[PDB]
Coordinates of C-alpha atoms in Angstrom, one line a residue:
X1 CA 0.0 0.0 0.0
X2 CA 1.0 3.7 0.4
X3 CA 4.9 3.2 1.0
X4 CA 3.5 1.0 3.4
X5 CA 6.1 -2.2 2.4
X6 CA 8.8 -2.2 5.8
X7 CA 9.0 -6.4 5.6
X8 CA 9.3 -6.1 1.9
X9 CA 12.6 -8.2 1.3
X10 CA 13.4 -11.2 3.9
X11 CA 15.1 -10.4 7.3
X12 CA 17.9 -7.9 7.7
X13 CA 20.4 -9.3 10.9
X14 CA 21.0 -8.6 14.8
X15 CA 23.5 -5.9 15.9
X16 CA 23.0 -6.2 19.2
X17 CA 26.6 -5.3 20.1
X18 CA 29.0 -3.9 17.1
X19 CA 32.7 -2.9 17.3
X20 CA 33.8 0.8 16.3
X21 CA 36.2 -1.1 14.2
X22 CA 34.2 -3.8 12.6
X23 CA 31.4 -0.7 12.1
X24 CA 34.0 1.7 10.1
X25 CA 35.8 -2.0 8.6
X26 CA 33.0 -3.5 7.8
X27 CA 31.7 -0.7 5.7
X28 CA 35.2 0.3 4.3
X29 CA 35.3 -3.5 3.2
X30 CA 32.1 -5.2 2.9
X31 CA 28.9 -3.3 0.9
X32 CA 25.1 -3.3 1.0
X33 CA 22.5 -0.7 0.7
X34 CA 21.2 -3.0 3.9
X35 CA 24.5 -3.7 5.6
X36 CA 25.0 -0.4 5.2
X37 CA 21.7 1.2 6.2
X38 CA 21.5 -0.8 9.1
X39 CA 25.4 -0.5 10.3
X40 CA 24.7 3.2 9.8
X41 CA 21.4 3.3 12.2
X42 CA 23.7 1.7 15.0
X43 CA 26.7 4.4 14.2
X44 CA 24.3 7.6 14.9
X45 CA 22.3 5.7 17.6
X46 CA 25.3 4.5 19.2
X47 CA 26.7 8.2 19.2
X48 CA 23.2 9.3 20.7
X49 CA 21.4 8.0 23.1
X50 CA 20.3 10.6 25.2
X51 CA 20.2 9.1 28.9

């Protein structure tokens, strides 16, 4: 419906804990509009919080 398609391909993956290195290796090495997306929601999260 109306942009309304979040599942639409299969699962994405867990990040529950990520390294600052594998974050800024991972996408220096590796690349994908998802790995990518997602690594970059945990880089901005990670770097706010706000207690």
């Amino acid at each position: 419906g109306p942009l309304g398609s979040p599942n639409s391909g299969t699962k994405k993956y867990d990040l529950s804990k990520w390294k600052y290195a594998e974050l800024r290796d991972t996408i220096n090495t590796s690349c994908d509009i998802e790995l990518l997306a997602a690594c970059r929601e945990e880089f901005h999260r990670r770097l706010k919080v706000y207690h």
